[PDB]
């Protein structure tokens, strides 16, 4: 109707959200190895050349 | 053996005259339409085969090939789709040629042997 239930349930969206499980996500190399990964990501494997970096773009 | 039964089935399929199943076979053989009639030995209770034998004598010639499963498998029942036999199960258990289609090689020879000796 006007409202599905009692408004101000004090935690409504948390109570009702579809709780999606976490993923597996193989281990990221953390430390200087993270600098490995990231430096290779940006400055030697140059990915987007036109205009700006646009790094982490929306897939569409 | 039986390499022309496939061929004549395909030729009649070209002209769409296969009395598939049994009811079409009966209605056609009571008429002067069915040319070749195949009933298989692998029929349960043998009443249908017995009736086919009684009727076809009366469109007289028949061929008594057994194992209708493979018959309807390659008699033109279903669809090949990919390379071969793309279906769960299929069969006819009785077939009748009403229209010849093609000719050449083995049309009336083994029918003369089987039905007219």
């Amino acid at each position: 109707g006007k409202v599905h239930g009692s408004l101000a349930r004090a935690g409504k969206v948390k109570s009702q959200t579809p709780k999606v499980e976490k993923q597996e996500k193989p281990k990221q190399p953390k430390g200087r190895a993270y600098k490995r990964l990231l430096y290779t990501r940006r400055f030697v494997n140059v990915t987007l050349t036109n205009g700006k970096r646009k790094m982490n773009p929306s897939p569409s | 053996i039986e390499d022309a039964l496939k061929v004549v089935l395909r030729t009649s399929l070209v002209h769409d005259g296969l009395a598939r199943g049994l009811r079409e076979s009966a209605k056609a053989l009571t008429r002067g339409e069915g040319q070749l009639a195949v009933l298989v030995e692998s029929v349960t209770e043998e009443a249908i085969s017995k009736l086919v034998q009684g009727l076809a004598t009366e469109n007289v010639p028949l061929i008594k090939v057994a194992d209708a499963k493979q018959l309807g498998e390659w008699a033109g029942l279903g669809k090949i789709d990919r390379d071969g036999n793309a279906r769960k199960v299929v069969g006819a258990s009785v077939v009748v040629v009403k229209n010849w289609g093609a000719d050449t090689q083995e049309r009336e020879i083994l029918l003369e042997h089987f039905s007219q000796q």
């Binding site: - | 209605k27 009571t30 034998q53 009727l55």
Partner: protein, 74 residues
């Protein structure tokens, strides 16, 4: 510019008139005379042609190849 009420029905149900899966109607149709002649059963259609069996209901034998043509008393 309008919200529609649900179509509530005061009607129990009407289902598809299912066709009857008849098991071997031809044995019902024919009659074998001991490995030889074979007779047919209950009529043959003159309006449609030989081989088309007719319908048994009562005081009338009925067509169904050309259904409306033949329904006559016998």
């Amino acid at each position: 510019g309008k919200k529609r009420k649900k179509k509530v029905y005061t009607t129990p149900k009407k289902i598809r008139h299912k066709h009857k899966k008849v098991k071997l109607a031809v044995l019902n149709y024919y009659k074998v005379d001991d490995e030889g002649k074979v007779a047919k059963l209950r009529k043959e259609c003159p309006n449609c042609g030989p081989g088309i069996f007719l319908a048994n209901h009562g005081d009338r034998f009925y067509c169904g190849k050309c259904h409306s043509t033949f329904a006559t008393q016998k």
